[PDB]
């Protein structure tokens, strides 16, 4: 009925465990994410196996449902993908095809609409997190390049299933992928990205949605957010300096808390500096991620060191009048995954883990 715009966030100062979806304790999926419309949240995932291949699909269930075969809806063939709601209808994004000649497909509602072709003739990938719609214009991060080497990203502006504009970010673009994006304000989409080869510092994208321009710089903060990591504050040189332990990586969580006079930036990180174990929640209020070296504050442990952390993502729940920022965690077990959701709610400290 109406287009969605980002709204100010619901009051609160901390996160608490909200919900755990753990289908194996009673369909094998990976890289889950959550996307929400005005009155509906969906839990999306890619199938990994049956209850990069020709059989992987983008599937979903209502958030709160266990993602069984009977409950799941198969939206499209996809070894990589994302989804979002523009206030009127669901947009589903997926990538399929050959590693060196992959293609993006866009589905709107029930129909297939536009496609996008690989540009670096390497595995085309999308953000594996939900896409961001403002006024009907959905901004999707895509990337195409080497797993190890250069992989420049670009953004697609998608309107009613069609790709209307290609946005080519400037700045430090040598390797950007698996971006967790959200609105900082009505004018800006910010993303905390993976760098799978050069550094443990996440590229931080600032996309201007009034001008359709973007610039990427590494986060300057001493607390490094990727999985392989130097031991906090150990990377020397200016903010843009690449550090050690840059080979490999993980998609992290990232949400914004939009307050009338402030932007809170909530980030997630693993507990281990080398292995994908545990998850913690970190926060910084205000500042500029591209210049501010200040360590992120530690809010608390979301997943203990003894449990798998793996991928995380940001999403927001539409609470009638305000938005609720949430960070989800993909707990991979043996390789299906459980999804743990932590949401901003109330005040005080994060009190318990998953």
């Amino acid at each position: 009925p109406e287009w969605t715009y980002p709204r100010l966030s619901c009051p609160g100062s901390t996160f608490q465990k909200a919900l755990l979806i753990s289908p194996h304790r009673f369909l094998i999926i990976r890289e889950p994410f959550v996307a929400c419309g005005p009155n509906e949240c969906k839990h999306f995932a890619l199938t990994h196996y049956a209850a990069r291949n020709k059989l992987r699909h983008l599937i979903s269930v209502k958030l709160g449902k266990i993602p069984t075969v009977e409950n799941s809806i198969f939206h499209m063939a996809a070894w990589s993908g994302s989804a979002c709601h523009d206030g009127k209808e669901w947009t589903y994004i997926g990538v399929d095809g050959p590693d060196n000649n992959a293609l993006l497909k866009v589905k709107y509602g029930e129909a297939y609409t536009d496609t996008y072709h690989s540009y670096a003739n390497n595995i085309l990938r999308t953000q594996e997190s939900a896409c961001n719609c403002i006024g009907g214009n959905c901004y999707l991060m895509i990337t195409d390049g080497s797993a190890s080497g250069v992989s420049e990203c670009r953004f697609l502006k998608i309107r009613e299933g069609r790709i209307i504009k290609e946005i080519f970010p400037t700045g430090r673009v040598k390797h950007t992928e698996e971006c967790t994006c959200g609105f900082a304000s009505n004018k800006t989409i910010e993303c905390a990205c993976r760098d799978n080869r050069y550094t443990a510092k996440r590229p931080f994208v600032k996309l201007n949605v009034e001008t359709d321009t973007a610039e990427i710089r590494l986060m300057c903060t001493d607390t490094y957010l990727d999985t392989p990591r130097p031991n906090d504050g150990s990377i020397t040189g200016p903010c843009e300096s690449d550090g050690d332990k840059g080979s490999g990586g993980i998609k992290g969580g990232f949400v914004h808390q939009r307050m009338k006079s402030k932007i809170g930036r909530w980030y997630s990180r693993t507990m281990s500096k080398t292995e994908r174990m545990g998850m913690g929640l970190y926060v910084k209020y205000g500042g500029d991620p591209w210049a501010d070296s200040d360590a992120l504050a530690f809010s608390g442990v979301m997943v203990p060191m003894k449990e798998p952390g793996w991928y995380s993502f940001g999403f927001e729940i539409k609470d009638k009048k305000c938005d609720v920022p949430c960070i989800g965690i993909e707990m991979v077990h043996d390789h299906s995954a459980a999804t743990a959701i932590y949401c901003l709610m109330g005040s005080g400290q994060l009190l318990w883990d998953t």
Partner: antibody, heavy 126, light 107 residues
Framework: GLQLVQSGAELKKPGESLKISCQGS????????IGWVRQIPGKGLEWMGI????????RYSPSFEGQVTISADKSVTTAYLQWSSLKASDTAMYYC?????????????????????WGQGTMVTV | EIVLTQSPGTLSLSPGERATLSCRSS???????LAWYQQKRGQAPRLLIY???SRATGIPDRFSGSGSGTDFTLTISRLEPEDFAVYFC?????????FGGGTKVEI
């Protein structure tokens, strides 16, 4: 207490099959690659291949492709090197070694890592 | 595809002397991924250097090893009886790992 423990020694006849192994301890075995390295006593080291216990993803040096089999079983935290037709010339020391950093399938790259820990080596005659 | 020809192949330096060991690659070593290992008689080799010149944990400052392109060295700032071993160079990039013949360091 980080280690790779190998079997002691074997002596075989030409044509007699052979399996030797390494047991890992002190690390998260299913996320690190374990390689096999051959050393004929008067020669240098020769990378034979690597395995990723965890999904048993293997890579072989072209010169050992089809000559040996590399396998692993995360259940007992072990890695194996097998021959079907042990010829002679396999009179070498065989070592396991684990890569310095963990790897996950979604990294999508070939582990560009050195071998950080080595087993003591298994001596195989013939 | 990548061949490492480590040389001279034998050093005959006394303790207290600086030892330079070379490793010439037949083609450029991408990203500088050339490791060095120390093999003492009767035992599995120890990792000294990884990346073109990063020092492995537990390795003394005696071992440096700067290098780039196709031309890499291992430098032992001062030899000690402890470091008379056969040294090996290894390509450890995103391709089948491959070692050199090895250089023996004698008194």
């Amino acid at each position: 207490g980080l280690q790779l423990v190998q079997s002691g020694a074997e002596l075989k006849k030409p044509g007699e099959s052979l399996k030797i192994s390494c047991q890992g301890s002190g690390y998260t075995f299913p996320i690190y690659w374990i390689g096999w390295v051959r050393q004929i006593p008067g020669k240098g080291l020769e990378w034979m291949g690597i395995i990723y216990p965890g999904d048993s993803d293997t890579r072989y040096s072209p010169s050992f492709e089809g000559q040996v089999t590399i396998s692993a079983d995360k259940s007992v935290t072990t890695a194996y090197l097998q021959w079907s037709s042990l010829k002679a010339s396999d009179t070498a020391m065989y070592y396991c070694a684990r890569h310095s950093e963990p790897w996950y399938p979604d990294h999508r790259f070939w582990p560009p890592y050195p071998f950080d820990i080595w087993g003591q080596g298994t001596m195989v005659t013939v | 595809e990548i061949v490492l020809t480590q040389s001279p192949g034998t050093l005959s330096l006394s303790p207290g002397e600086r030892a330079t060991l070379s490793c010439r690659s037949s083609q450029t070593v991408s990203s500088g991924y050339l490791a060095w290992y120390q093999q003492k008689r009767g035992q599995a080799p120890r990792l000294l250097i990884y990346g073109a010149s990063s020092r492995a944990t537990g390795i003394p400052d005696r071992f440096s090893g700067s290098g780039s392109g196709t031309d890499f060295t291992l430098t032992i700032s001062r030899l000690e009886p402890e470091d008379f071993a056969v040294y090996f160079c290894q390509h450890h990039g995103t391709s089948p790992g491959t070692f050199g013949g090895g250089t023996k360091v004698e008194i």
